[PDB]
Amino acid sequence: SIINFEKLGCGASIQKTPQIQVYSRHPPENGKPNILNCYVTQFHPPHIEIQMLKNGKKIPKVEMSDMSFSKDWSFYILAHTEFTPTETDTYACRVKHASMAEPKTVYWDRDMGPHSLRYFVTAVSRPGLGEPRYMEVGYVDDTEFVRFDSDAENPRYEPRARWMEQEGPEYWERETQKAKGNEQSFRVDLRTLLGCYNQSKGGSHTIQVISGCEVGSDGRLLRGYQQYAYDGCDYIALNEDLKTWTAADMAALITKHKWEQAGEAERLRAYLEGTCVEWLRRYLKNGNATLLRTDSPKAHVTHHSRPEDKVTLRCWALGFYPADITLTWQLNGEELIQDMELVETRPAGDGTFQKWASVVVPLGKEQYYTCHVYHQGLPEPLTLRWEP
């Protein structure tokens, strides 16, 4: 259960480039149906246009994940489409974003314990196009379990995991109505931040909050979060002592001084130590079965033939959960950290993740290299070698 937010009240009335990977859900064999993904990350502002192209031409039925953002405030989203890969068909993903002069097209190539309850809030103004879009997204240990999105005709808190369905009607009504009250607080703050940052009234702007608690096995609060960003930059944050605020710039000093006078750190302390902890506990009971599951990586090495007497070994980790993983190549028992290539961990789209690490080795020397896979679901690290 998210807190009811206090208005920022900063006083009476910057862009990040997307990163793109394009890859299939399952290893591509020609003729068999599959899923092509276009994973876009690290971008701000959140408005973005993503097209998937087949042989130069737009692909019509392209589904898209709901948009999320990460602890560094940048947004991310998964686009995907069904496709049956063939030998000569070319696929690609094209991204239009205000941080880029021109749309970026990225082609697909067929080779190359403690617990937390956190809420991720977004409010984006859209002058001329509608009311600000407001979202609340709840995560129990990085698993999304509830969501409120204002862009519906009758906005409602929705379960996002089957184990939330057992909460009664009284719960969803209370959350829904708290969300609509929260929505109005951010609408007012979006108006007000314009003056505070001396901005024009026709531009789109963004408020983001991360709010919640991390709780140890003993049931005691390990860390509390209440941090705000305006246009993708720190604005204000409760300190680890849960008594004082860190204001990232001058406009936030007005909010801080105000929240000091109002005792807002103390209201947060109480929510964080009590209410947040107690609800986390409740969501853990409901989700007991599913939330604790891990899936360990199945790994394998692939071989790719380069110019001259160099070859590339690629080490793959597929179908693992959670996303945290380490891949390393070794030669003679030393790690080749400084000369190997790797991709950012990426969702398969069925709820699990993929990663690979590659190294360039001499032709005929493939059996001198060993790949290591470290994942928390493994009883023991995996060790693998290329094999024909």
Residue numbers in the entry: 1 to 13, 24 to 122, 143 to 418
The authors write:
MHC Is are heterotrimers consisting of a transmembrane heavy chain (HC), β2-microglobulin (β2m), and a peptide antigen, typically of 8–11 amino acids in length. Major histocompatibility complex class I (MHC I)3 molecules present a diverse array of antigenic peptides, the so-called immunopeptidome, to circulating cytotoxic T lymphocytes. Here, endoplasmic reticulum aminopeptidase 1 (ERAP1) and ERAP2 trim peptides to the optimal length for stable MHC I binding in the final editing step of the antigen processing pathway. The construct consists of SL8 peptide linked with β2m and Kb HC in which the C terminus of SL8 is tethered to the Kb-binding groove through a disulfide bond between Y84C of Kb and a second cysteine within the peptide-β2m linker.
To confirm that the A-pocket mutations did not disrupt the general architecture of the peptide-binding groove of Kb, we determined the structures of WT-SCT and its three alanine-substituted variants by X-ray crystallography. In line with the structural similarity of the backbone between WT and variants, the previously identified hydrogen bonds between (i) the terminal amine of S(P1) and the phenolic groups of Tyr7 and Tyr171, (ii) the backbone carbonyl of S(P1) and the phenolic group of Tyr159, and (iii) the amide of I(P2) with a structurally conserved water molecule (Wat1) remain preserved in all variants. By contrast, WT-SCT showed very little difference in B3Z stimulation when ERAP1 was present. The peptide-binding domain of WT-SCT displayed remarkable stability as evidenced by the root mean square deviation (RMSD) of the corresponding Cα atoms with respect to the X-ray structure. The average value of 1.2 ± 0.1 Å suggests that the overall structure of the WT-SCT fluctuates around the crystallographic coordinates at the simulation timescale. All three SCT variants displayed lower free energy barriers of dissociation with respect to the WT-SCT and in the order of 3–8 kcal/mol.
